[PDB]
RNA sequence: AUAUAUACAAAAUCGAGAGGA
């Protein structure tokens, strides 16, 4: 019944909020500094460690302003959190590969303006 | 994909844990108790951020415990189908790639690989190759991939990948 | 059905299963796989563990199609003395890898050739095609040539491409080649500079400053000109380290001066304490890799994947030494900007790139060497239990037991042949012992059994072979061990051969099976992979690859079987033996059980070797290559000469004067030197061709006595065998000064304390201080379990010194 | 230079009558 494709989800994915795998990547060695450190507590499980691994792997943001600004630029164009977080962690080349990625942006900008939303972000992306 | 969301429980406490303190042990029981498990609700339960209310914290006649009520944020990993997500080859098989898009485990069926690729186990190391070798799938390699399905195992999702369309596929 | 061709066609049957099939060569494919497999299986490994030769072998190997005993053992003189039979075995298992290699190698080829097709169509590729694939030595060197190629025209395959991570892409989009190009000094030329650590190739200087060129290309992913200096170096970087030979120096770089450093995780510092096998290395410091010991890295990366410890390999600078290269000197101050530039790059070259990925493959090697290690240990250990003769068929008598408290012991009569004649239950104590011993030496006497096998289960061993002892003198006894009876006891077959029995019982016919011929018994009992690796082989056989192991130590199989010899009659007549024909080169599970079959199927007995194909269908490269190694008690047979040289053998035995003439040599060698070796090798040279003078030696030694048998002669266990086999701990595993708990009993002036090991312990009296003193209960209550540290062994008396001092214990 | 055990709850329903406080 759920569908990415089709833009279609169950209710409680509607408020909630999204992330991009470098977001996720900060917080997730923000748990292990809490981890490392206040010993006395319980190990992070292994499906702790394979998140981290992954978004670690394919985090394109590598500073937290960068993130920030990233995401604060898809904001201010009427996007779907999903396509937001979409975009943002694939990072796509040219428009149509962000269509065969992302079908919900099927018609919604102009393949230009869109052209020139990706090459905000890859502008923004941080060398690591 | 990942998320940030809002969720409910309810702890039992034991009367030793009456005393000074004992706000924290109803934070470190929902630590101990919501972290690591996942639920095909809301797939893979990364971690919890914060809390937001303890309850008030109502004696259970008889019995003695305490059930304070919880409401609390945390992040999600929940795969939806139709996606393209990342996804890093751990093994090849004659059916397919088992991939993982994060902690989920996901599989990409020999029909579900396209059809210019074959399955080569002679490989030094074993991969799906094109027969000029052009694009070449082995361990490590990440990949596109779109999830077509998602299935619920023991509260463990597990994903179904294809390769088909444009884009996907050997990064 | 794929195993009816294999069952008929005519290869060796191992020949078939091979992932990569054996095609022929060409005799200049041959000789350049010769000389790979030599520089490369005879090359020095990373921690501290002719080619015409190889030629020969594998010619036969690929174009005959014998199998690697069968060269071993009828080529010899084509291979020795420089190859042995591991090394046969080594050099096929190497011609595989030579075959996939030359099959990638293909495969490039054709790749590149396309491109070349398509961009004659519109850098491009002249030697480099040439030059590169070619001379592609290892497979490493491979990817290197490919990733290189696809950096550059990876781009273009004539579904869409799959855009790439590496964002080498977007700069090549805004012509970021452009500012690459003018740093000095392309790619190609860096890594030469590098090849001859100086500066062969100087730079090209410009007449602006980056900053200038990048206003020419400073556009709309790269504003800020700055932004267009990263990308440029970036690229420049990307290219340096995949241009391969920056990639060759770099790896042989860090195959010399690479360090291993290494601290412990959290869940480290806690749990590797003095007995966990990390406590040797938990912290590292520039240990280089040339001193990893034998299986040590295999030990290292486990406990990294138990995550209780972390490592890295580096160098430490390199850094310093190769910026001097792509470097100038005038210090215009519009070259002190290219240098920096230029030096930056190649940091983020090595920094990012090649020392990272240069780690992880010197690690796949190491921690392959170590692998390989253990399987050979694996290997060695189950060479030593198969190359053991048997007793000196015979009636073995065969007793195990258990722990014993209210458990019996049975002995199992097992006949010369093998199979199981009769068994015997041998279960205030004093008299029922007597009793026990009384009907024991009634069975002894009835059934008078060559030799008296007790198992090794711990102490009581001891205890049962005493008592025997005791028996028998008024005919041997020896200590034997178990465990691949416990093995045979535990496995479904035990159940199918007696339904009846105990599982004790199971053990008793394996234990006295396994004293009449150890290699049979392995075989029967090592039938499937399971089977074979619950046999503890080496403490760490559990991580090493499991089709290698396997191959390994079925190899070790192979090879005894060959030595020994299979006799088909009996493993017909008596089909316990029914396993070893597998092992028989030229016969496999499949050709094996088929043989088997067809030999049922007619009910008669293979009277001859001849009678192989002449009564089966085998076809003639399989009787080559087995015929040899199947006796058949036309009495040329049941002797290791092949069929191929019975008219040689003849021949020698009229010169000894046929047969009254072979009987007369088979009743005696006449003359053993009645031959001249020189002379028979000289007639070969027109009558049969070859420097065959070391098969003659053979032939006469053959005739003397008809499958004389290689096996070294059973010896019982030194002390040392019977401690490490009794208690089941190995020499290391009693470190002295181990910390162990142990039992207290009595104090019978000492304080005889029980080990779970089976293992007395006496702490001495010094720290005991009590020889005519009081007893030392006001030092510790009798009875209870305290855990001390050893600090003397006595092996031939199993005990062991203890400490009661924590100053001892710190 | 020694030292023997371990299984689990069996017993119903209906009707009548007689009593007890």
Known sequence: ???????????????????????????????????????????????????????????????????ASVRSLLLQKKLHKFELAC??????????ESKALIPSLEGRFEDEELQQILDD????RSFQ | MFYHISLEHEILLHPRYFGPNLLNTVKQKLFTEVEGTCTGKYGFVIAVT?????????????????????????????????????????????????????????????????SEMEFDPNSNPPCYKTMDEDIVIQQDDEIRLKIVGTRVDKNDIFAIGSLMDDYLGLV | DQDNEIRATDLPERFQLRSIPVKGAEDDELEEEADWIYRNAFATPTISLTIQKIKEALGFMRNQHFEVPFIAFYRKEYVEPELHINDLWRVWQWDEKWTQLRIRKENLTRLFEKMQAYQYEQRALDTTDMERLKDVQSMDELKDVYNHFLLYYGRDIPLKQASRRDMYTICQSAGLDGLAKKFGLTPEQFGENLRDSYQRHETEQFPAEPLELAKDYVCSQFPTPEAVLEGARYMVALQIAREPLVRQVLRQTFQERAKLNITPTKKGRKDVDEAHY???????????????????????????????????????????????????????????????????????????????????????????????????????????????????????????????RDHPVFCALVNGEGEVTDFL???????????????????????????????????????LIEDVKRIVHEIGVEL?????????????????????????????????????????????????????????????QEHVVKEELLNALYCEFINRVNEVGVDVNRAIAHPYSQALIQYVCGLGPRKGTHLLKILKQNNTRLESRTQLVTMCHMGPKVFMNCAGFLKIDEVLDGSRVHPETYEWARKMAVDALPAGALEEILENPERLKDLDLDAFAEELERQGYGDKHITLYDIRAELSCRYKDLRTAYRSPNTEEIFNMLTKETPETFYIGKLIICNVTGIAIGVKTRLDNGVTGFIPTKFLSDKVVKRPEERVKVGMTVHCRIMKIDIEKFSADLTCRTSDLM
């Open chain 1, 87 to 96: 975009l943002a962690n694939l990072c796509p080349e040219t428009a149509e």
């Open chain 3, 278 to 404: 990390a406590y040797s290395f938990k912290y590292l410091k520039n240990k280089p890799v040339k001193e990893l010991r034998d299986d040590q890295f295999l030990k290292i990366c486990l406990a990294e994947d138990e995550g209780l410890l972390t490592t890295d390999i580096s160098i430490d600078t390199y850094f310093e030494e190769i910026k001097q290269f792509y470097y100038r000197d005038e210090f215009s101050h519009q070259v002190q900007e290219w240098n920096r530039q230029r030096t930056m790059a190649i940091e983020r070259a090595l920094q990012q790139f090649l020392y990272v990925q240069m780690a992880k493959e010197l690690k796949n090697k190491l921690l392959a060497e170590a692998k390989e290690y253990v399987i050979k240990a694996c290997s060695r250990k189950l060479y030593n239990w198969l190359r053991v003769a048997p007793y000196r068929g015979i009636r073995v008598l065969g007793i195990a037991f258990s722990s014993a």
């Open chain 2, 50 to 114: 914060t809390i937001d209310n303890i309850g008030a914290g109502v004696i259970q006649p008889g019995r003695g415990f305490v059930l304070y009520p919880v409401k609390y944020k945390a992040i999600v990993f929940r795969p939806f189908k139709g996606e393209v997500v990342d996804a890093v080859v751990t093994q090849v098989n004659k059916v397919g790639l088992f991939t993982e898009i994060g902690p989920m485990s996901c599989f990409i069926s020999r029909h579900s690989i396209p």
């Open chain 1, 121 to 124: 972000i890859q502008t923004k």
């Open chain 3, 480 to 540: 034997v061990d178990n465990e691949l009876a416990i093995l045979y006891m535990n496995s479904k077959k035990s159940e199918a051969e007696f339904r009846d029995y105990p599982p004790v019982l199971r053990q008793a016919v394996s234990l006295a099976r396994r004293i009449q011929d150890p290699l049979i018994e392995f075989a029967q009992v090592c039938s499937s992979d399971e089977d074979i690796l619950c046999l503890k082989f080496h403490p760490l």
């Open chain 3, 425 to 463: 239950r041998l279960p205030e104590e004093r008299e029922k012992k007597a009793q026990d011993i009384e009907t024991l030496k009634k069975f002894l006497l009835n059934k008078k059994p060559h030799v008296v096998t007790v198992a090794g289960e711990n102490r009581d061993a001891q205890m």
């Open chain 1, 1 to 67: 019944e759920e569908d990415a494709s089709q833009l279609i989800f169950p209710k409680e994915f509607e408020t909630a909020e999204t992330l991009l795998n470098s977001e996720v990547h900060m917080l997730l060695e923000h748990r292990k500094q809490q981890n490392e450190s206040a010993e006395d507590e319980q190990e992070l499980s292994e499906v702790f460690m394979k998140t981290l691994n992954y978004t670690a792997r394919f985090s394109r943001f590598k500073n937290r302003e960068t993130i």
